[PDB]
Design a protein around this ligand. Sequence first.
Ligand SMILES: [Mg+2]
Ligand SMILES: [Mg+2]
Ligand SMILES: [Mg+2]
Ligand SMILES: [Mg+2]
Ligand SMILES: [Mg+2]
Ligand SMILES: [Mg+2]
Ligand SMILES: [Mg+2]
Ligand SMILES: [Mg+2]
Ligand SMILES: [Mg+2]
Ligand SMILES: [Mg+2]
Ligand SMILES: [Mg+2]
Lengths: 95, 60, 144, 220, 25, 63
Amino acid sequence: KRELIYKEEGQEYAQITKMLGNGRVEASCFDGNKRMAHIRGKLRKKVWMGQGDIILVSLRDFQDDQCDVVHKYNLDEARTLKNQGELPENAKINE
Amino acid sequence: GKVHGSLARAGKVKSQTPKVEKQEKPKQPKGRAYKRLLYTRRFVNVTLTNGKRKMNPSPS
Amino acid sequence: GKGKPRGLNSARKLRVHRRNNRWAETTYKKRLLGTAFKSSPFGGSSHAKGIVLEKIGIESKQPNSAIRKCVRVQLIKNGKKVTAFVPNDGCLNFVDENDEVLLAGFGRKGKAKGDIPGVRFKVVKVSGVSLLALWKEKKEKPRS
Amino acid sequence: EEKGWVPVTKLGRLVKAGKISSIEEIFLHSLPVKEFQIIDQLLPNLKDEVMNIKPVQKQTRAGQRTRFKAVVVVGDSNGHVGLGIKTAKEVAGAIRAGIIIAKLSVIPIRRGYWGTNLGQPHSLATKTSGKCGSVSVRLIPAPRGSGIVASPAVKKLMQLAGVEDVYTSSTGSTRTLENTLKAAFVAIGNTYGFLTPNLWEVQALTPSPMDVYADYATAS
Amino acid sequence: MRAKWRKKRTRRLKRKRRKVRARSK
Amino acid sequence: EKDPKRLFEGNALIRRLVRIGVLSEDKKKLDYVLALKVEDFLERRLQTQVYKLGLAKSVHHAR
RNA sequence: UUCGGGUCUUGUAAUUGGAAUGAGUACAAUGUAAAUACCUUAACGAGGAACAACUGGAGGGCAAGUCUGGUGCCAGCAGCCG
RNA sequence: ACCCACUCGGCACCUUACGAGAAAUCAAAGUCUUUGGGUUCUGGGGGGAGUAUGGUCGCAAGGCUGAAACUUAAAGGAAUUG
RNA sequence: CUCUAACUAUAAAAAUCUCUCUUCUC
Ligand SMILES: [Mg+2]
Ligand SMILES: [Mg+2]
Ligand SMILES: [Mg+2]
Ligand SMILES: [Mg+2]
Ligand SMILES: [Mg+2]
Ligand SMILES: [Mg+2]
Ligand SMILES: [Mg+2]
Ligand SMILES: [Mg+2]
Ligand SMILES: [Mg+2]
Ligand SMILES: [Mg+2]
Ligand SMILES: [Mg+2]
């Protein structure tokens, strides 16, 4: 059990819209945007991802539309987060 | 945690490096004197004849 | 043997043989086709200044892993648009979009270098002052 | 350095008896050499310079096993050259075996003149070539004092030869060192293997030393 | 890929573009 | 050999080299002047000749 | 025999003194159409002789570190391999 | 018609290196750094691509002629060991 | 130093596959 990672004014939590090739991903970000994110190294083939997950993503302060994955939540931490209210709860994802 | 700050800071490690200040630095002789001093260091004040010249040896 | 013309009065055929064979090596062909001016946004120029449009971060190639801070720029001398890398770590904050930047070559005669694809151009002077000077804080941008 | 050296290879026995003045009487009669103590005894001051220790690998069912090939050149800078390439698991053993091999394959050369012969000929006597793989090496004689114009490896080879001046030219992929050194060594060894026109006279074919001194060999 | 089939694709494209040009005239 | 251009220009070269004295007075042959071993031209520097004459005492002093 | 002469030579203090002069000044003249500038040359003019040599690099090509601190496939570096 | 022996010409074959090459191997792929018998035609890293266009021939399929922009540090040959 | 003989006969199906590649002088 690892502690979940909070946002520190420069990264935000997003929902994978679809899965794109070559390390890209489309992330519906909970800021009213459909951003594009990259597989940050140290995580490419060490932590797998996919459609219908919740990922912490760090935004590029100079280039807006593109951003990079940082940390993903394993079906436990994201539900906790929506319980506190760190994320808008209107996006419903349940298997 | 996984990242201390926000990635792509565009010059991050510059800001977090610990600054250090040049010490007193006695003036090394320059020009002809520099060449004389270096030649004296290498070939007439010979330090290691045990095979390798191994000059500027790491302190260990 | 050595099936090239070899008589004492065979200057023309052998010379034109060379004249047609030289069209194979790339440097000579590029030199005479004049493609260094129609192509190659640097109009045969070692340097050219341009105006910044935005600051895009280009992803590295496969074995390396990093996100190199490049910058788009529209040149003045011919109007064409191109990206350009920003060396010398602490200098993306020096870009200040909509400022003049003096681009040079990038070490590979108009070819992408190493792990930084889609770009072939360095950056040496911005706002008149040198990136090497800015990075080591010997001079400052007047900020016009 | 126990100089016991029980002499196998009858020639060596003669060398032990001190009945050979110099390796000339060997080379003149094309006498094969097998024991390195012979070349140690005759030429007293061999100097060696290992040129490269190349790692070499092979694939077995369990990982990669590695040896090292030492390419060491030996000589005395007075008209005697030799080359030894030898491989072993240990670097030191490899270089020692390469020293032995190079000492066995000592080759004498023909130092000639660029023109207007003077004391102590400086350059080669004839343009001479050699080949190994695609390394095709060429040596052209040099005017006195022009120095050795060659690649680092060939330059060291020429210095070990004693030739103070020779121009070189190599074609092919001289990136490899073993092929380049072997080809250059063959070329420098072919200097005698080329009929120089100042040698019309056919000599009376002096008796071989191990022929006239076959009695002292094979100590019963 | 096998160059036979790449050439076949290219010739299919040639046929399509030639038919388009013929319809244009 | 004996070519008048050879005989004149080479002899002038020898004359200059013995006037400067880098070449010895015995090796005047147009052949020895082909190998000089660059140290020799250094030996005729003003500081070097001063030190060999004295007055210098650790050449840098003279320098 | 505890030593220990230091028996044979090197440097380390980076402390202390006796000499010399340029770079800058500058009387004057020479120089020049007039001039500065150069060559001289009075008087000045060196102790940290602050009168302070930068520019690149230290895995290989390629001389030179497997010393220390920080970052932790991020920042970047890297002409090619990395 | 066979057998023998000799010769001229062709498809070839066997042994071999004393030559060749990177090697597979070649009696020509030799007589080549000891570079020179006469001659035509091809190629200059790999993709783009034998593609775009321009011709040119063809009823048609297409053939011949034939690049660049750009991208890349390899693609490839031969043999060796697993 | 003379020698030209013996033979058998199967093909069912079987797709896909993640990091991480680096060190030899005495
Ligand atoms: Mg990323
Ligand atoms: Mg100063
Ligand atoms: Mg520095
Ligand atoms: Mg450093
Ligand atoms: Mg080095
Ligand atoms: Mg460190
Ligand atoms: Mg650096
Ligand atoms: Mg090509
Ligand atoms: Mg193609
Ligand atoms: Mg057509
Ligand atoms: Mg193969």
